Design a binder for this molecule. Sequence first.
Ligand code: IPD
Ligand code: IPD
Ligand code: CA
Ligand code: CA
Ligand code: CA
Ligand code: CA
Ligand code: CA
Ligand code: CA
Ligand code: CL
Ligand code: CL
Lengths: 272, 272
Amino acid sequence: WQECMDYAVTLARQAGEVVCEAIKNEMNVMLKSSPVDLVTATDQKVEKMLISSIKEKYPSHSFIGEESVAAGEKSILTDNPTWIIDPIDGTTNFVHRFPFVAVSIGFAVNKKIEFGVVYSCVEGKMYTARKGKGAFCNGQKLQVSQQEDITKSLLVTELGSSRTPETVRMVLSNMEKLFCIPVHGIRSVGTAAVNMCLVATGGADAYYEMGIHCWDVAGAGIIVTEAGGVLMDVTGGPFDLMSRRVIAANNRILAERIAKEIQVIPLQRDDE
Amino acid sequence: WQECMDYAVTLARQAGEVVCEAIKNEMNVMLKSSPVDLVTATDQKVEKMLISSIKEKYPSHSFIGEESVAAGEKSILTDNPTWIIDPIDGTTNFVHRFPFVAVSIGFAVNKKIEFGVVYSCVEGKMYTARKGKGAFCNGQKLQVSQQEDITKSLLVTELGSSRTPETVRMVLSNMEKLFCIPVHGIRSVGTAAVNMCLVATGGADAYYEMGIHCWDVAGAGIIVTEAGGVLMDVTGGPFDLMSRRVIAANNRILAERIAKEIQVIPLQRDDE
Ligand SMILES: O=P([O-])([O-])O[C@@H]1[C@H](O)[C@H](O)[C@@H](O)[C@H](O)[C@H]1O
Ligand SMILES: O=P([O-])([O-])O[C@@H]1[C@H](O)[C@H](O)[C@@H](O)[C@H](O)[C@H]1O
Ligand SMILES: [Ca+2]
Ligand SMILES: [Ca+2]
Ligand SMILES: [Ca+2]
Ligand SMILES: [Ca+2]
Ligand SMILES: [Ca+2]
Ligand SMILES: [Ca+2]
Ligand SMILES: [Cl-]
Ligand SMILES: [Cl-]
């Protein structure tokens, strides 16, 4: 797998420069399922680049990509080596030139993530992790924080892609409960992968969100765990790559305290 | 005033050095008005260093410093050349190693801001702006976005320092109104100065918040305006550096719209 991983990094840095060059220019913004669900030509171009370059070196491997799924593909995970890709995580940020956009790649064999590569191109941070090998950012080994007291934690989360009054009110309600525990604060950088990568570095204590997809957490999840953290479903149950929900914390203590506070929003699984 | 400005940029970098060095070490985290209102020995020393270095060259100038005010000094602005200082804007981030901390310095004469210096030490970004000279970040001229459609804007704001149910509910409700207009999204990096600087670059279209202090925005405000932006009061009226309220936008079109949507949160002015 090291051959594939080293290849993924080269590919990530490559797709990374395409994105980071495109960000400097005027874009043609297009909508997908709503006026806030955006996509551009770069999202599509980069994804086709990645898939081709991968199936060119590894023709037997399967692929699960955000735009490919929107192109007609089904997001079904088998035991076969599968590349779970998100060409640009932070499309809205990308469109606005907000300094946080990443290229995310996850690789799963036997339905388990072997390695994850997350490239934050604007800042030039390459986050990588291989099962049992550790998590790193530009050669620097990562380690999650040791905070076990919720009232002294810094959390990260996003408001979501939905504008439905009920869904929104529930998200804000969950945000309120945690906020008033209280915790030191809540941050929102604009991308699931980076938010999680910040938890891995220890700059944030935990991340939680409902509404995400497999391509959002496939690369960063392994990075949090290899940094010493834990992944979990919002329900307190085990993490599920297709569940649309996740809690990426420094330790099990915060994860369960957070789970205890938030109310689940009904979501449709990616494998349905 | 240019001499003062040149001296300011130097002092800010020197302070930035100190802050960014301490951020990697063990620190004594103390409390101010509550368990979530923090301060560290670095906040205290950096301010003392700044005020002393300034008082040496310009002994006839006045100062307004967060920690000085906390120590008993009153935040009263006069027509005399006053240095409005925020040693560390983003103390909670500092304590958590969250990659966004800034040293802010605002210089006012006749109660108007002449220049501002904001140094984001972790990123090594020096934001500066003299009235009528333009705003720059590391020697590159800044310019706000041109979005006049609120439904395509990206806003930045913070949840605040209060955990009072009543207040937290107004903050989240104001957030709910803007989010469901809808807007493309809402971000929170954890520091008012940087949030405003991101608006000056165009990465975000507008920033708003009620609860900040004069030292939080004295430096970044001139950067937004010099970048082509506008500072406004939540009432839609002119900006009042001592009111605890602010709307820093790319243009008046968006600013007026935000002021229309949000509800005022009762607060004690800095001059009361
Ligand atoms: O659309 P995308 O920009 O690839 O990814 C989005 C980002 O990860 C965002 O932070 C998260 O809150 C959304 O749920 C995702 O869909
Ligand atoms: O305490 P400080 O970190 O210097 O300043 C705070 C930060 O700027 C924060 O982002 C803002 O939301 C608060 O209102 C400020 O008081
Ligand atoms: Ca998307
Ligand atoms: Ca994407
Ligand atoms: Ca994504
Ligand atoms: Ca403070
Ligand atoms: Ca401060
Ligand atoms: Ca501050
Ligand atoms: Cl905070
Ligand atoms: Cl958002």
